[PDB]
Amino acid sequence: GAMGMLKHISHGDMNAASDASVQQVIKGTGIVKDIDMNSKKITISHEAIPAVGWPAMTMRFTFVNADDAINALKTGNHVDFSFIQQGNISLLKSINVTQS
User: Fold this and answer.
1) DSSP class of residue 4?
2) Domain 26-97: which topology?
3) Domain residue spans of the chain
């Protein structure tokens, strides 16, 4: 053996953490069918999302904020998006134009 080990990596730190956030923002893609800003729902005709197990069909994703993206993008445009499953309520987390 060869004595004289070199401490390259060390902590010198005292912390503790215990979490694994499994609430992943469920991203899909589809074409904007309608945006009802009065009813606060973006109706996106979405392609097959295997994550939730919803095939190629339309769905109203309810949005928290009428964002620059939401306001500038409209019916006929192909977007990507992100949402969560709040019971049966699809609460739209984010929505981006996939080609720009």
Assistant:
1) -
2) OB fold (Dihydrolipoamide Acetyltransferase, E2P) (2.40.50)
3) 26-97
Could you give the CA distance from residue 16 to residue 19 in angstroms, rounded to a whole number? Answer: 10
Angle CA 17–82–90, to nearest 5: 100
Q: How was this structure determined?
A: NMR
C-alpha to C-alpha distance for 67 and 64, rounded to whole angstroms: 9
CA 38: distance to chain centroid?
Answer: 23
By DSSP bridging, strand 26-36 and strand 78-86 are: antiparallel
Q: Which residues lie across from 59 on neighbouring strands?
A: 44
- Write the DSSP assignment of 47-69 as a string of letters: --BTTTTB-SEEEEEEESS--HH
DSSP string, 13-26: -------------E
Q: Comparing C-alpha atoms, which of 39, 46, 35 is closest to residue 72?
A: 35
